[PDB]
Amino acid sequence: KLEAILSQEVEAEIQALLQEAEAKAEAVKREAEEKAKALLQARERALEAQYRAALRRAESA
Amino acid sequence: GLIKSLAEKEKQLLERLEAAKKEAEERVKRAEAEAKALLEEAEAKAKA
């Protein structure tokens, strides 16, 4: 019967929204993980420089 | 001869839609909060 159609039409949009709102909750997690990697990959590299310099200095000394 | 059908059905389907939007927001938030807490761990390491 019609109306039960209208109620089978909402419980459908209200999964579309809940599908859209948990396909961003990953996108946030992806870009946050792809951030942290790069926020620690540059840091890894920095310590080498700050250490490559410090030991050379200590060789010369 | 009975407005209670269309009147009181609208105000449940519309209210069911709002609850959908709530746990849409109050969950999408959680992912952003999880992100903050991750990048804190991303320092705890860097300082360690």
UniProtKB/Swiss-Prot annotation, chain A:
Superkingdom per UniProt: Bacteria
Coiled coil: none
General function of this protein: Produces ATP from ADP in the presence of a proton gradient across the membrane.
Similarity comment: family membership: Belongs to the V-ATPase E subunit family.
Protein name, as recorded: V-type ATP synthase subunit E
Full-sequence range covered: 3 to 63 of 188
